[PDB]
Amino acid sequence: TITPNLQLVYVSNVERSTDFYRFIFKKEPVFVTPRYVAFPSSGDALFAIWSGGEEPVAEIPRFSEIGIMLPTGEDVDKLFNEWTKQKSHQIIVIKEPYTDVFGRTFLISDPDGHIIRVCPLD
Amino acid sequence: PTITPNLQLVYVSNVERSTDFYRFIFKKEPVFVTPRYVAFPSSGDALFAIWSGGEEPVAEIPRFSEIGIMLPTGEDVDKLFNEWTKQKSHQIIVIKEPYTDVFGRTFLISDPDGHIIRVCPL
């Protein structure tokens, strides 16, 4: 068949990133080992964090995004409100909610500088 | 609303060449095409998108993520490699030839903007 069913990101601290994605996704990982953790994605697809590649560098620009498509533009803002209201987890804002071609969007950075974009279903 | 990472977005320099590249790699037409934004189906309702409106990628800047393709067995992985390097129409930049890593039988290639693509087995 041939599908991109594994989105894989390099992380420096597997514990801290596991805990961050657990909070972002509101889901447990389906696979945990000390250096490699996978969270469910859509269908038989996985989103994986791994310390076995190279350690991300904050000052190095990134050329991709972890996109999170929710049903509506309303789900996006009340997901930004809920994320930035809570104190317990560091949510670094890159762009507060605005309107792109697909609609209501925002951008946060994960602990290792991976860009996460939240947006409505295109 | 469930929060899934269902949009793997990559920045490309040339949407045309990238669309032709991904079309060949996936064996699949894209489902959404504009001049600056192209999406291919991934698993479930997830998408793999290429976008020229981001920061333009640079070949020699290191990358901290990978586009993973999980096939059923190690013997598909070796299979997929022979084909890709064998054919002449589409230039395929090998980063690592087939070897054993933590995923099993894997290999790595680069897309035309230096995005890293890994093929491995479920």
Numbering used by the authors:
A (entry chain B): 8 to 129
B (entry chain A): 7 to 128
Pull text from the paper.
Enterobacter agglomerans strain Eh1087 generates the phenazine antibiotic D-alanyl griseoluteic acid to compete with other microorganisms in its habitat. In order to protect itself against the toxic action of this compound, the bacterium produces the resistance protein EhpR together with enzymes required for phenazine biosynthesis. EhpR belongs to the glyoxalase I/bleomycin resistance protein family, whose members have a wide variety of functions extending from simple binding of toxic small molecules to their chemical conversion through enzymatic activity. The EhpR monomer consists of two βαββ'β fold units (' indicating antiparallel orientation with respect to the other strands) that are typical for members of the glyoxalase I/bleomycin resistance protein family.
